């Protein structure tokens, strides 16, 4: 008679075993399935085609943790990878509601970790974002963010990380998503609280901080137009997005963090809060044009990472629009901006992409628009050489050449900068905008 043995069943058998009466077979099959899918795109795709996904999703409702946790670990692996149809299939058999239903029942960290990791994987697909925003938002906030944040101490850092990563992804575009998240009771409060807690533990680099700050940057995007009754008793809810404290947090992250994505996100949130014409935008821009904050922001211009350089540029740009210590911005911004243009000894700026260079040029233009001393510091840093090098390039694009001409035409507006170039033989038409 037939002893037990180590034979490997075929995929279709494993999938059928998901429906065997014995819970222990279901759970071992789900587990084995998770293992088969691990780092194996082809297997993930075959599971979809064999119609395993709705089976796995059905098992989330199974009362026994071994089965539902087993099914979930498999879905997590299946929700990861290049075949985006695997994520869509999970959505199409109501995987998100099922994940959410299980989340509300979960009592343990390991299961909550797997559910939220799966949601984080799903949230990267654009077609699943509003599904998650509409069906998981409130469970993620009420079951995870608020209780584990410490807000009313911090714990379950890994689950919080997954969960903020998920909310960050789904809020990466769509005003409807930003508005829905901004409106969720306690969500903004607790994110700010988490980021403060971490900074207080001397953690300014964790993925948790990263996900929270990126999320906060998303919610700060267009807050001035999207806040209910844009018309602008303590601040609460989305009002916290533009109070002094969070602004101070971004600035402190600019000084303490070494992680490019966190520096970019913090500079980005500052940029977003500074973009709008509205009372709070004025307050925040005015506060940010002080010596310490300007230096914190300008210093990211010496960061070796392009995307950080670009973020600093955008932030500096929005500060310059209504600036009033013309000397200040000028002093803090111009030398580092000019260093990041091609045409000197800094190798890296010869390798920046077109969008970065245009960002810097536009920012330069804004900073010198009515600021003779800024224009002078430009001239003093050999930045005219660089503008001409860009403008007269035989290899850069029309947009980049034009961006350089714009700055040149602004420079041409000032008599004191004009006469010295005329002494070289330059005339205004050498630098036409087209």
């Amino acid at each position: 008679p037939p002893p037990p043995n180590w034979r490997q069943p075929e995929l279709p058998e494993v999938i059928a075993m998901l429906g065997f009466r014995l819970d222990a077979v279901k759970s071992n099959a789900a587990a084995y399935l998770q293992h088969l899918c691990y780092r194996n795109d082809k297997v993930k795709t075959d599971v979809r085609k064999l119609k395993g996904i709705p089976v796995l999703v059905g098992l989330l409702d199974h009362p026994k943790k071994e089965v539902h946790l087993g099914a979930c670990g498999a879905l997590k692996n299946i929700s990861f990878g290049r075949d985006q149809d695997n994520k869509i299939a999970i959505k199409n058999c109501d995987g998100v509601p099922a994940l959410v239903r299980l989340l509300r029942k979960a009592r343990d960290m390991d299961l909550t970790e797997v559910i939220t990791g799966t949601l984080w994987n799903l949230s990267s697909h654009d077609s699943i974002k509003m599904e998650i925003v509409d069906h998981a938002l409130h469970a993620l906030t009420d079951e995870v963010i608020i209780p584990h944040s410490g807000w009313e101490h911090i714990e379950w850092e890994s689950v919080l990380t997954n969960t903020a990563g998920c909310l960050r992804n789904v809020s990466s575009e769509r005003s409807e998503a930003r508005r829905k998240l901004r409106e969720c009771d306690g969500l903004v409060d607790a994110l700010i609280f988490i980021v403060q807690a971490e900074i207080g533990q001397k953690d300014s680099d964790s993925k948790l901080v990263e996900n929270c700050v990126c999320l906060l940057r998303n919610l700060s995007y267009q807050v001035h137009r999207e806040i209910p009754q844009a018309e602008r008793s303590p601040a609460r809810g989305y009002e916290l997005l533009f109070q002094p404290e969070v602004v101070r947090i971004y600035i402190s992250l600019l000084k303490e963090s070494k992680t490019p994505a966190i520096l970019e996100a913090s500079a980005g949130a500052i940029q977003n809060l500074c973009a709008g014409r509205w009372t709070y935008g004025r307050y925040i821009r005015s506060a940010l044009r002080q010596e310490k904050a300007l230096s914190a922001i300008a210093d990211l211009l010496t960061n070796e990472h392009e995307r950080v350089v670009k973020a600093a540029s955008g932030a500096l740009r929005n500060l310059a629009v209504d600036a009033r210590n013309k000397e200040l911005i000028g002093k803090h911004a111009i030398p580092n901006l000019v260093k990041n243009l091609p045409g000197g000894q800094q190798n890296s700026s010869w390798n920046f992409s077109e969008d970065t260079v245009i960002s810097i040029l536009n920012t330069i233009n804004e900073v010198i628009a009515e600021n003779l001393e800024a224009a002078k510091k430009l001239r003093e840093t050999q930045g005219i050489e660089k503008l001409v090098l860009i403008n007269k390039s035989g290899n850069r694009s029309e947009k980049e050449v034009r961006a350089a001409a714009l700055v040149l035409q602004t420079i041409w507006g000032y008599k004191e900068l004009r006469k010295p170039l005329e002494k070289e033989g330059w005339k205004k038409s050498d630098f036409q905008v087209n």
């Binding site: 037990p4 069943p9 998770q34 293992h35 997590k76 990791g117 994987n121 990267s124 990563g165």
Partner: peptide, 18 residues
């Protein structure tokens, strides 16, 4: 966007799969 959930390997008892 980042699929930060990632993927994990798993344990199982192959002998019970029949």
């Amino acid at each position: 966007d980042e699929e930060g959930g990632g993927e994990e390997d798993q344990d199982f008892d192959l002998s019970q799969l029949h």
